[PDB]
Amino acid sequence: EMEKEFEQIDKSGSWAAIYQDIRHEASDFPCRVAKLPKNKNRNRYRDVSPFDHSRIKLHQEDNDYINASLIKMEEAQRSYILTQGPLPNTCGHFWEMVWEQKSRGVVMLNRVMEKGSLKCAQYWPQKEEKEMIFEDTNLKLTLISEDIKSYYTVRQLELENLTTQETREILHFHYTTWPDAGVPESPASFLNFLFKVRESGSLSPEHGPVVVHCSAGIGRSGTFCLADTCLLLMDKRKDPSSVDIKKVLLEMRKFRMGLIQTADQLRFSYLAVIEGAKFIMGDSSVQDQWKELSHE
Structure with missing residues (x-):
């Protein structure tokens, strides 16, 4: 069982060894x-690459490469696209992927600048009146509205295929107070954020897979998807005990390398799923307690 395993591993201080296994x-x-030379400048980190079998292909005949992986969770019935933070030259590719994959939501888990370094291009418009046009992929992106809470921001974007003039609303979920180092002490703000994404319909199967990223798209993005899928699985059977987090994480790692970068992120994942179970279990009031403790 999950809470038993958590305490056992904790009291034993064996999180590093668990995570290393x-x-x-x-x-x-x-x-x-x-790894092809023509793609070197499409990759932000040479040690973080999509497997060939699960990579998202751009629908173009020149170069279909983007550093993005489709994580298809068969049992849980949820799919996610995990990607790196766009580079100055892949912002058009990024929105092209969002269009072609019919995604409704983008989850961003990093700030544009962290630890005094640029982690991510400014790939969405910050002002309604200053829309962005990506000439290579022929797409237009307009900030429609913005809802700033204390630790995350939700943006409504309109994405227009400049070739076909059809338009789509994209929801941008921007979790801004992940700490520069380490993980969050409590998972309540994290869970309140995940449930915000869930409530928006961005995760539901009538839309394409949600696009999740931080700078490399494996660590914080890994934590987000693992908690979501774990909670989803406990829901479908209401069997908290039947969900094995580590085996879910290894299943996810079949589709993209490196998901969950530190032992403390693994431990935090446990925390989030265990606490999130209090909602799945029938205690609907626990969601509003997280909204209080988060200070949104």
């Missing part, structure tokens, strides 16, 4: 398209 058993698949 996951590192060792994790799938290894080729990344040959990612």
Whole structure:
């Protein structure tokens, strides 16, 4: 069971060894398209690449490469696209992928600048009157509205295929107070944020897969998807005990490398799922307690 395992591993201070065992058993698949010379400048970190079998292909005949992986969770019935923070030259690719994949939401888990370094291009417009046009992919992006809370921001964007003039509303969910180092002490603000994304319909199956990223798209993005899928699985059977987090994480790692970057993120994932279980279980009032403790 999950809380029993958590305490056992905690009282024993073996989180590093648990996490390292996951590192060792994790799938290894080729990344040959990612490594081709013509794609060097499409990759933010040379040590973070999409496997060839799960990579998102741009619908273009020149170069279909973007550093993005489709994580398809069969049992949980939820799909996610995990990607790096766009580079100055891949912002058009990024929105092209969002369009072609029919995604409704983008989850951003980083700030544009962290630890005094640029982690991510400014890939969405900050002012309604200053829309962005990506000439390569022929897409137009307009800030429609913005809802700033204390630790996250929700933006409504309109994405227009400048070729076909059809338009889509994209929801941008921007979690802004992940700490520069370490993980959050309590998972309540994290869970309140995940449920905000869930309530927007961005995760539901009539839309394309949600796009999730931080700078590399494996650590914080890994934590987000793992907690969501774990909670989803406990829901479908209401069997808290039947969900094995580590086996869910290893299943996810079949689709993109490196998901969950530190042992403390693994531990936090446990925290989030355990606490999130209090909602799944029938205690609907626990969601509003997280909204209080989060200070949104």
